[PDB]
Structures are given as C-alpha cells and as structure tokens.
Amino acid sequence: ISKGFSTQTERINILKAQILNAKPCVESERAILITESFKQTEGQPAILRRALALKHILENIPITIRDQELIVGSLTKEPRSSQVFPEFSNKWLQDELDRLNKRTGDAFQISEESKEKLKDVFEYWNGKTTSELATSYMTEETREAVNCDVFTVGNYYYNGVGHVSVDYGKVLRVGFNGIINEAKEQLEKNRSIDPDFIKKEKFLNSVIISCEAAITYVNRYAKKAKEIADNTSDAKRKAELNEIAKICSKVSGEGAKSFYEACQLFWFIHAIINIESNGHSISPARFDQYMYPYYENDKNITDKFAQELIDCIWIKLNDINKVRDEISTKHFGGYPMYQNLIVGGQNSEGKDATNKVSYMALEAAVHVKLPQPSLSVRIWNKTPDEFLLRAAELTREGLGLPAYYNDEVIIPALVSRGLTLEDARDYGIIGCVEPQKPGKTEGWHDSAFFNLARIVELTINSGFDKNKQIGPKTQNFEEMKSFDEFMKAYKAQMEYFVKHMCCADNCIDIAHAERAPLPFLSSMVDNCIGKGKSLQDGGAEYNFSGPQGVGVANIGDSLVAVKKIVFDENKITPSELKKTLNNDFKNSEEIQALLKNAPKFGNDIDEVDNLAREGALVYCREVNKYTNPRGGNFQPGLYPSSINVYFGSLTGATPDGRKSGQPLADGVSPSRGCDVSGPTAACNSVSKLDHFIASNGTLFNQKFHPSALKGDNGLMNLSSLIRSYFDQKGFHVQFNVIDKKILLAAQKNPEKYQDLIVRVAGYSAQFISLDKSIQNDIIARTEHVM
C-alpha cells in the first residue's frame, strides 16, 4: 500500500524559499583571492601554488550563515550563486560580462563593482590557465577537428574536472586531522635520498597545508555562529546557533561522532571541494551507506530531527551554482551541478543494503522538492519490494526522481573494466549515469560530448561540410552499391573524429596535471597519499576517461532507412537521398515520407533496433582504443545532458526523416513520437543495445501521463516495467510524470510556477530556469500510459 510522505518542518519551507527567491549571480571574491595568492607564489611548484591558493581563499573568502540554517557553509553571499575560477579559463567571462543578465535561461546577475574588479583578474591570468596550455598541447589537426561541430571537449577545457565521489566515509571517521596525520606518516616512510621523493614531498606538504586550511575554514563558521548567537533574542534560535558553533568547533579537525556532526562535516567536505575547483558532478554517491552508521549509533536524536537535518543538506546541495559560457550553458541547462546521491543496492558481499537512511533520502526529496540532489536508487535481483515501491511512490510525485540503476548490469560491466568484485558491488553514480567505486577513482566521467548524427551526415557527404573537407575523404555515397560500403565509410568517419576527441581530451588531461593538480581533492581518494601524487598525476587506484555519444535513436533510424529505402528496396538512389538531405527535404516531401515510415527504434522491431545497437557499438569500439595520461582506459557513455538540442541545431537533415536543425534524441531514448507501441515495447528496444560496453553509462528517459501512476496498480506497473527492462539488461531508466498543461502554463506565466521541477536527462531542473528550446524538447517527448 502507499504510505504517503510526511510533512517537512516550517524551517525547511523557509530555507527552500531562500533558494527560489535568490537571484543567481557571479561574485568576484574567490577570483580576487586566488589572483592575489598566485602573484605571491610564482617561485613555487604548481601543487604548492594550488595548496597556498586554497589556503588564501579559505582564509579570506566571505562567510555566510543564512537565517534558520541548522547546517552551515555557503560558497556565495547570495544564495544559488557562483564564484569565478579563472585558473581554468576566464576570457569567455570577460567577453560576456554585459550580457549575462540578458540570457533567456540560466541568467546571471553581476554587480558593476564585480565587473571592475575582474579586470585585473583577466589581466593576470592571461596565458596562465589550463585551457590555454591545453590548446598549446593539441596539434593543429586536432584543433580543427575540435571546432568542426562534431564533438566538444569544452567541459574540462573551460572549467574544473570534478566527476568524483571522494572517500566521505573515511573523512567522516578520521576528520581532517586524520588525513593530515596520514600524510605525515607517508612523509616519514618516504625519507630517502632517492630524488623521486622530492616531488612526492611537495605533494604531501600540499595536502597538509590544504587540510589545515580546511580546519581553519570550519572554525570561521564556529566563530560566526557564536557571534550571531550573541545577537539573537529568540532563545530557541540562539541555542541552535550555539550548537552550530559547538559542532563546527568539533568537526573542524576531528571525525564525527553524532549524526548532526556527520551531517555538518559531510557538508564541509562537500563544500570545500567546490571551493578548490568548480568541476561539477561532485557526487555524494552512497550517502545511505556511510551516513547510516552515524544515525544508528546516535542514541539521542529523534527520527524527526534526523530527517530535518537531512532536509537541510538537501537544501544546501541546491545552494551551489556555477556560471558557464553561453555556449557551454546550452550543454548544461538549468543551473545544474549534477550532484548524484544514491540509496539502496547491495553490499560488498552481495547482500541487500537498504537501511533507514535509504528511506529518509527518498522522504527528503518530497520534503524539499528542489532540483538537487540528483537522487537515485540502486536496483538488483533481491531489491526489497517495499523499497522499489517506495521509489515508485517518489516517481509519482512528478519531480523526475529518482533515477533507477541496474546493479545486475553495472557490476559485471565494472569488473570487466578492472574493478574487483567487491569494489564493483559498492559502486555509486557520478553526475548523470556514470558508475564508479567512490573513494578510489579518477573517472573523467564527462570528458566530451560526441555528435553521432553528424557522423551519419558526414558519411553521406564523404567528410565534406560547409565547403570544407573536415573529415576523411571516404567513398562517394553516390557510387555505393551496398549497405556494407556505407557502414565502412561510417566506421571510417567515426574513427577519425573519435581519435581527435580523445587526443584532445588527453591534451586537456595533461594541462590540468601541469597547472591545476588538486592537493585537497586528491587527499580523499585512494592511493593519492600513498603514491604521493595527485589525481591529475594518476594517483587514483582506478583511472578512466569517459566521452559521450549523443543521437543513438537518430543513428539507428537513419541506418535502417538507408539500408531499406536505398539499398534493399531501391526506392531512391544514393544521389537522390544525398540531395534531398542537403536540401532539407525541400519539395521532396514524398522522399521524406518514405524515410519517416521506415521502421523506428522503440517499437521492439529487430531490424531497426539492431542497427541502433551496431550504430552505437561503432562509436563505443572506437572509444575503447584510447588510453589517458593517468594510465587509464577510455570508456564510452551514451547520455546527452541537455546538449541534444544544441547538437541538433548544428546537424543537417538526417535519413530518419528529421529536418535540419531539429533536436537529436536524448540518451538511448527512442526519438519523439517514434515509440508508438507502448512503454514495454520501447523498453525491449532499448534493452537490445550493448549497455555493458558503454560502462560510462547510458541514459533512458520515459514520460508518463499522471493517470498511469494512479493507485497501487500504478506503482505495481511502474515497478514491473522497471524490472522487465533491468532483467533484459538495461542500464538505467527514469521517469517524468507530469500534466502537459502545467508545462505549457509554466511557459506562459513563469512567475506562477517557480517551484515546478522537471526531469531533463540524468537530472531534474526548475522548469522556468531552462531555455525555451530545452523546455520545448521536454514537452515534445512521447507521453506514455502503461
């Protein structure tokens, strides 16, 4: 039966309204402080510059405690706002200063004072960023490949890496002190005349300086809290602030003992990561697993307060924001941070791991109803029925939550990639759908987005685009007499651009290692202290790079149409198809119709489903060939963020009948309107892809009419739909459940729908913060009933 969800405290409503009422802006303090520090450290190795910079920022950055908070730590004075990270790139920001507040979606404010202060920042960091070094390392051929509108390596180019779940459990246990002491013991073991230990020493000292700065940072909140307490009339609130002060003083360097201590230290670990770097997808992962012991051992706290504290963490996760350039902003719409948090699943020995915190996590989603955190559940063969039903009940709330992940596939896929069975069983999710063993991995889980549709376009046009030969000169499509010749050309186009994408990624990898190795983040991931070298320098036990294919359904539908309509049935010649496509079907609607009526992916039709499989495997097999400077292997993924709209706008008409400039399909979802056989048939279709090889993750969106979720039956049916998809080896699935009228109404009167949350792809967003183009893509998705 459905138990419903409990009601959150009034404090939660007040804290939540601080997020929604805020006006996202760009603040300049961090930028000024890191600039000031770098000017003083020119003579220092990069790792020490990084340590000292973080110390300087942590010591002098403005601190804020917002009204009624129980969990403190704010990265910006204004809520839901963003600091600047000029160590990675900053010229885009200098270019956009005056139009940030004019954007359709993801608008940012910026004070005239901030503009003026950034001038010196732009001046100092000229030539000194990771982005500029990265470009220098790339060949000219690669630079051209990168600007062809085939792929983008922007993510780690313009901003930090992130995409990591640190060893939170460990830091919660031993505190920032424990990390420091571990670093000191390693320094002692490394006493040696071997020159190899010189650089390792600077790294270990950097870890120590960084963690000491962390302690300092926590203590500043301890002090501010007391100071506010001394100026508070209300006895209840005054006592909260005094308890905040007490807690911060303890977890400033010690490990947590009580639950409240765990929650506050958790957030400080998470917050400080986001101060050192603005790499997003900083993902809490198995929060239920490492937080539950602190809950269960706390024999005073009430379930109500434990939940309130959790709700406060939820709200804080929505306080972080990150400004991006106007182009990249299209890739990541809706102010997203992609902080993935997962509950349930199995433990190291393959037994179920559902605990009370697992359920409180689900409860928090309904208590807070904000876009963050990106809440997820692990599903496996012995998932408790009530757990899956509780997740289904969350789905019915229409927040887009939770995303569902298949242990049965992910575990073997990970072991395949070199993880032990124990490490694989303990996986969490990074960002949207990217699996890793937390505390042990530098995964690079969103190193690039790659446009598969463009490859099909270039196969047909023999690598010729906009009057330039941008790809290999593969066989003229006009002369092709078999579909096999087409697949070969398609493979050859793919080989060329995947090659330059990955080498470009490698150039960026080197740049980060060379100019932004992270002493603080590295200290919390296994092997870094022991090897005495940063994440960037290959310290992680596990290393990967993960570029994404985008346009899967488009590729399958295109390939089957080319195969059937042209090569099998000879309805049109290759020349005719090529011309119609370049003309965007102008005055050849009859040919467009033939293409549209070819079998479409998402209807359990093997002829097309298999070509979607093979079309995607071609991408995947190419990605598998590459290794990164950290000694790790590339692994492909298939998820779009919000880039399928932008990508689609850069893509000509395709053989599936899609007009030029139209959005590509999201993830591995069937194209809009193509899945006309019910959601089970679509699930069967998507499950035919190789979800094992795409171990950087695949993303499957479905959207239901609210009636489909109504009643116990609704929950039973969604649960049954999920299980059948997972039994057939699907990787991931997630559901929008919303009334179409509400989205259209939100478009017309945004101010009336400020709290409307919708699922984009691997994350949910505040609907009205999204650009109209992304809003329309979501509205246009197929709506199913059961």
Place this chain on the structure above:
Amino acid sequence: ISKGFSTQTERINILKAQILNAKPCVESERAILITESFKQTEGQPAILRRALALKHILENIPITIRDQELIVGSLTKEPRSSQVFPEFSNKWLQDELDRLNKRTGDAFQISEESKEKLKDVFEYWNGKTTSELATSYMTEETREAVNCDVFTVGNYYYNGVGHVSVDYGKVLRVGFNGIINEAKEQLEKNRSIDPDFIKKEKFLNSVIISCEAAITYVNRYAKKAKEIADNTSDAKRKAELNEIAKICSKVSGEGAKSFYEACQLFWFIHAIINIESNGHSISPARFDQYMYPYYENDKNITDKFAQELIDCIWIKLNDINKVRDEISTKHFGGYPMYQNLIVGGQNSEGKDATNKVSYMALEAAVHVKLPQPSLSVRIWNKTPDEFLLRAAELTREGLGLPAYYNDEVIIPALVSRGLTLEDARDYGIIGCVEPQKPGKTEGWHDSAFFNLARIVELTINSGFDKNKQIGPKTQNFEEMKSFDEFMKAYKAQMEYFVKHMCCADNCIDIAHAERAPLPFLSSMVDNCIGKGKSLQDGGAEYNFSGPQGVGVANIGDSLVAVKKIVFDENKITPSELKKTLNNDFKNSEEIQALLKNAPKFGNDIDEVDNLAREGALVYCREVNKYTNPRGGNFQPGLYPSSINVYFGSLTGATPDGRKSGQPLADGVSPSRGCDVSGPTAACNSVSKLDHFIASNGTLFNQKFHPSALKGDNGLMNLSSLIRSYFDQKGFHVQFNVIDKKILLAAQKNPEKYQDLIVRVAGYSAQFISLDKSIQNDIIARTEHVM
C-alpha cells in the same frame, strides 16, 4: 731536438689585440629579447617557450663582424663581453649594477642605458627563474646546509648548466638541416594515439624551431658580410668578406665540405650554444679527431691558411665571456669560460690517433697565447715521443698549457662508470678535468664545490660552528681516545653534508628540467631526438652529476697530525688541540710547530700519503651513494677552479698548522711549501690517491723554475716526469713555467703585463684580470726544479 714554433700572420696579432684591448662589459639585448618572447608564450609548455625565445633572440640580437675576422660570429658588440641570462637568476645582477666596475679582478662595465633597460627584466622574471623554483624544491634543512660555508651549489643555481661536448662531428657532417630532418623522421615514427607521444612531439617541434632559428642566425652573418664587402675599398679585404658570405650561406643548413666551411660551422654551433644558455665548460673536446678529415680531404687549402683559420678559432674562443655574481666570481676567477679542447690519444680500436690537426692545435696555442681554449693532450702507453716532446715544448712557453690527461686511468674509470670500451676510449675533457664521451652525455661535471677542510673543522668541533649546531652532534673531540673514533666522526660529518649537497643538486636538476629544458643543445647529444626528451629530462645515453672535493692536501696533513701528535704520541690532548685551533694558534706557537713538523703530503711518505688517500675516499664513497633525476649516478671529482682561496677564507685554523683564513690547497696538489723532496717525490705521493673512483676528474698543479725546462734535457725530464706519474695511475698533471719576478712585476705595473698568461687550475688566465688573492696563491705555490 726542439723544432720551435712558427710565426702567426699579422691578422692574428690584430684579432688578438681586439681581445686584450676590449673593456669587458655587460650587454642587455639578449635579456630584453628573452623577456619580450616569454611575455608572448605564457600559454606554451616550457620546451616551446625555450625554442621560441631562442628564435626571438637569434632573429633580433645584434650581429657583429670585427675587422680582419676570417671566422665570424660575435655574442656581444664589445669584444670579450657578456649577455644576461635572467631565466636562471637576475636579482644578484640587480643588486650589483652599480659596483661591477669597482671590482679588483673580473671587472665589468655596464652602460647607464643598459641598467635602465634591465629594470623591466628584473620585474618580469620575479619568481620565474630556475633558481627560485630550485630553492622551492629544497627542504628547509637543506637550505640551511647549503648556507653553512661547507659547500656551494651555486654553479647551476645562478646560471646555466653547460659542461658538455656536443656531437660537433655529426653536425659538421649533416648540418642543421640534417638535425632537422632527423627530428622530422622521429615525428613520423612517433605518430600514435598513445598520449606519451604528446610531450615528445612538443620536444621534437622545439628542436626544429631551434635549428631553423640557427639557420636564420647564420644567414644574418652572410648578409652582413656582403653589406660590409660592398663598402670595402681594399680589394683583398673585400674578397675575404665576400668569401665569408659565401661560406655562411653554405653552412646555414648544409654540412661542411671544405676546411674553411668546417671551421665556420664549428664556430656557429659553439656560439649558438652559448646564446641559448650561459652554462660554461662548453668544451670542443676532440677537435683534432672531427676536424682532421675536413683538413685532409681539402685538396686546395694550404697548411698556412689552415693554421690561420685555426688561430682565428682560438681567438674567437676568447671572445666569449660571462658575468657572475660577486661571490661566484671568486669560485671562477679570470673571466673563465673553461672551453676544454683536447688532442691526441687513441681511437676506439686502441690505436694512436695523433694527426696533423693535433699538432696545429699545439701550434695555435703559441700563435695566439690567450687564456682560451683550455688546451689539453691525451697521453697513453703508445703516445708517440714526437707528440709528447712537442707538448713539452708548449709547456716550456709558459702559458700553463697543455693540461695532460692519462688514458690509462681514465679509460678503465669510465668503463667502470658504465661506458662501453669504445665510448670510453673516445673520451674528451669537459671544463677543467672532467672526462666524458662527447655527444652522449649529460654529465653535470661541476655541480658543486665541497669544502673538506670544513669537515675536519666540524669533526673537531662536533658539528658546532659560529654558535649554531650546523652539523650532526658527533662525539665530543675532548672525549676521544683513539684515532678510529676521530675517523668515525669525520665520516658522520661527511655523510650529513654530502647528502644535503647532492639533494640540493637534485632540486636544481629538477628546476632546470621544469623551467629550462634546452631544445637546441639537446638536439646534438645522443638519444635526445630518439627518446624525444631533452637533456634535462634524461635524454642522454649517459647521465651523471659531479660534485668536487676541495682541500685534499689539508685533509691528509690534518689527519696525520691528529693521529700522530694527539693519539699516537700524546704530545697534546684533544681539548688542547681543539682550543688552540679555535684560537688560531694565538699564544701557542709551540703547538703549531708540532703540527707543522708532522709528516706532510707530497714527500713520498706513506704514513701521511695514505691518510690523504683515505681522507679523500670518505668524501668519494659518500658521493657514490647518490643518483640524480635523470637516472644517472653521482661521481666525485677533486678540483678547485679558483675556489680554494675563497674556501680557505671561510675555514678556521686546521690541524696541519694552517692558520685560519688561509687558502686551501689546490686540487690534489700538495700544500704550498710542503713538498720539499723534489717533483718526483710529489708525483709519487699524489699517485697514491684513488684516481679511479674520482671519475669526475682530479687536478694536479706543479710549477717549475724556467731553468728546469731549458734545452732538450728539460723537455726530456718533463716528459719522463709525466710518464712516471701516469704509469703510477695519476689522472692529470699540468705545469706553470714562469719567473717569479715577472708575476711580481705584473702586480706592481699591470698595464705593463696585459698579455701575461698564467695557469690557475684546469685553466689559464690573463694574470692581471685575477683578483690579488688568487695572484698571491699562485705566486706562493711551491716552485720546483727537476
């Protein structure tokens, strides 16, 4: 019989006077140009910044052709002058700007315009030098050990590395074009998706850019030569200039064919090296081996013209100069560049290699009579008598040339260190006395000077000095009951300081790799192109580091005095000795007499000779423990340059009877006045040391009254002296042959003696250019007759 020496052309006299009449100054163009370039390349990896900076310098540095020159290429406008290399250090220069022309010796002029232009240079390079990164890499304990007055790692700290003989032979054969093409071929071989090839690619491109700039530079001379010809009336000089133009246009890219072409290309290789970096000891090495074929195949050139050409090289070798800080100038007195050039010896087959060019080199020394190059001969078992007697005849000229080197010890010593027998047989000398396989080695052959006398001082004082505990707290000398106890403490002091010396060297080693990898120099040393790695990054086939011990005679004499006067004979107690030494023998001349009268090194007395051996071995065994960041081993050397005087001024009274502040002994030579049994007895003493383990070279000075070399007998006696020493496994020997009166007269009336050359240690200098303290040390040396 004595053949005598031929007479140089009048042109040689003119060119020589340009050198002696010059007023050495500091010029600013290079500094301004490197600074300018670095400002444009902030976003580039270090190796490319190096290449682009070299390009910018070579394109815009002032070009000078001096009157009557046949071989052209001048690093400075003013002859015998120095550019500035702010990439290594520059604050010392900013500090000394106004007192460079006030120096006692090694004085430099500098215009007010130059001082003014250097301001922006000092400003830009703040924090950005190799020296500042080096200090950053050093631990605090090491920084203090470095500033204890025990050793100095200043050489590669304040300026460039150098200390290398590039593959001149290869570049003469294939030209800068051949080097470029080799690099272009590796680029081809290296094409791959493996990320390791990314950094190698930038190295190879940098080599290409560098060698292309080398071509540009030569072409600039070609043009300037023509322009000067066009305005020269004198038909003869006009034709010389036109021929110079022709030769430069030919060797700007191509390898040489004629002998004239080889001489000019030779000089451009050598010169450009000295533009990239100011590391000294850039040593031509086996000039007679790689230049002879060009001489022998040239069927048109006359011996006279070939000799004039060689004499022109000799003079050009004196045109290069290098300004150093106040302190470092004491380590390297006499405007020294230490460009070692060796002739004779054997080949790889173990057959004698004496050729016509070997003799023309010896003749050039007498034709030119300037301090450079540091001319040397190899001696072995089958050295032809004619050759050795001819070398003797040169020694009689009183220039301090040549330095003699013993194949019989050096060859096994090198093979011991990992060279093949073929490579070892082909060794040349670097700097003063440091052997290497030219074209295959990054030797770091003068990475430090180390004060052995201070170690004796610190053993007596239990690590305590100037009221600070600067070394380990070894056993109190007062309490010692056996000489064994003394030797143990002596070892412990040695261990501590050698450790920090070598580790300081490694920090500097890393700083050079990180901020100044050299694309141009690296391209001419084996394995660099093939490994696609700079010299700084371990590209050389052979890698070493070579720190020097100073004070060998003082150590043996001190040790025997402690052993005999204190522990054997109990003439005085340890305390009494310790107190009198700290008192500088004040009011205890009777105790000083005991010490002075103890057996002295240099008289074929085993008791003291063996302690000098062991005293030195303790240093050497310590050095052998260390490896550098290029995977090479440390090897010890025993030579002083001119630092034995300065070192002596920092050293207290020692147990050999030497008063506080007095100079230490030079190289492995006996202390002044202690060798009272003739030169043969002295060679016998010195030959008892381990010359095999000190494979970075040992240096032995003797000084003869000119009567000792009179007639055929004199020559025979010198030759017999040398043979007897080398038969007993001496490493090296060199001779001053000069009237004491002449030196004394040079002191009183310098302007009367501008062309007086004297041997210092491993090099000859213009006597009047040397500070008084070094002049006096040399005058005070023991003067022998046969």
